[PDB]
Amino acid sequence: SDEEILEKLRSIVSVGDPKKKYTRFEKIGQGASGTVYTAMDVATGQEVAIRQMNLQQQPKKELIINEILVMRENKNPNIVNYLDSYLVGDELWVVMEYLAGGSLTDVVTETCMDEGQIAAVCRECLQALEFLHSNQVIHRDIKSDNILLGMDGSVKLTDFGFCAQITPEQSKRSTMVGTPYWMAPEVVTRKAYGPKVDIWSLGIMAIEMIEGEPPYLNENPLRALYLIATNGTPELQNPEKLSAIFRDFLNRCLEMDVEKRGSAKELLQHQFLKIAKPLSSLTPLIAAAKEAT
């Protein structure tokens, strides 16, 4: 219902008009998902990202409430911090911490990471995923675009628009929600999948970090999932360039058999993560990427 959704958003949000509370607006985005700005918390000096939406033209408002509630109750150092929300008339505002390091996409697209930098990023993501899965949250849309970076090398998952919450009674999902190139084969071949779809996705993201894109990126999306289903574990262009332990880490992420594929908990113990460089090692790639876009 339209009315009920508004009453429910009303209870969630803080009161009043937030344009007093934030000063230096610069639009950095737009679309059906509304408009995104960077701004400064006029009180505390903190730089924030704000999404403004008009509700009279948002299709699936249930997804919006769900996302906010999920951010609120699942805080974690490797998840982009949800700050506050506001509702002025039909205009909903969501305020998030701002991460100046850009997206991983910028990084993989403009720079070449070494194995130690990749291990560090992979470690940080698995920390997020272990926490989420242990709380029965499946992100379902893991990709470099949904990794945000701090200037200090900090690594945070974002965009929980497509996440699933599972339960012991309904602990498996079937909805095809993720971005095609990153989707596990079982999302298309079967109608039952679990949290390990995020691990497959992370594996594809690891491929991004090596080759600069996920496999089949040139192909039409429609055709990607067919290729994913039928090729199974994707091939690297120069596997021999990789360390044996990195290759083994990938094989565990990209295992066709869900049961053999590593869980996050399991993968956090993998020895590949132990060559991780300090997160600050990422700052030169971040700066360079920033300067290239």
Ligand X SMILES: CCn1c(=O)c(-c2ccc(-c3cncc(C)n3)cc2Cl)cc2cnc(NCCC3CCN(C)CC3)nc21
* Chain residues in the site for ligand X (CB under 6 A): 29, 36, 49-51, 64, 67-68, 71, 80, 82, 94, 96, 98-99, 102-103, 106, 148, 158, 293
Q: Which is nearer to ligand X, 101 or 194 (CB)?
A: 101
Q: How far is the CB of 69 from ligand X (least distance, A)?
A: 9
Q: Which is nearer to ligand X, 72 or 274 (CB)?
A: 72
Q: Which is nearer to ligand X, 13 or 202 (CB)?
A: 13
Q: Which is nearer to ligand X, 94 or 210 (CB)?
A: 94
Q: How far is the CB of 80 from ligand X (least distance, A)?
A: 5
Active-site entry in 17, 141, 152, 248? 141
Is 141 assigned a catalytic role?
A: yes
Q: How far is the CB of 98 from ligand X (least distance, A)?
A: 5
Q: How far is the CB of 186 from ligand X (least distance, A)?
A: 27
Q: Which is nearer to ligand X, 67 or 211 (CB)?
A: 67
Task: Provide φ and ψ at 279, rounded to 5°.
Answer: -55, -35
Return the HEC string of the chain.
CHHHHHHHHHHHCECCCCCCCECCCEEEEEECCEEEEEEEECCCCCEEEEEEEEHHHCCCHHHHHHHHHHHHHCCCCCECCEEEEEEECCEEEEEEECCCCCEHHHHHHHCCCCHHHHHHHHHHHHHHHHHHHHCCEECCCCCHHHEEECCCCCEEECCCCCCEECCCCCCCECCCCCCHHHCCHHHHHCCCECCCHHHHHHHHHHHHHHHCCCCCCCCCHHHHHHHHHHHCCCCCCCHHHCCHHHHHHHHHHCCCCCCCCCCHHHHCCCHHHHHCCCHHHHHHHHHHHHHHC
Q: How far is the CB of 101 from ligand X (least distance, A)?
A: 7
Active site residues: 141
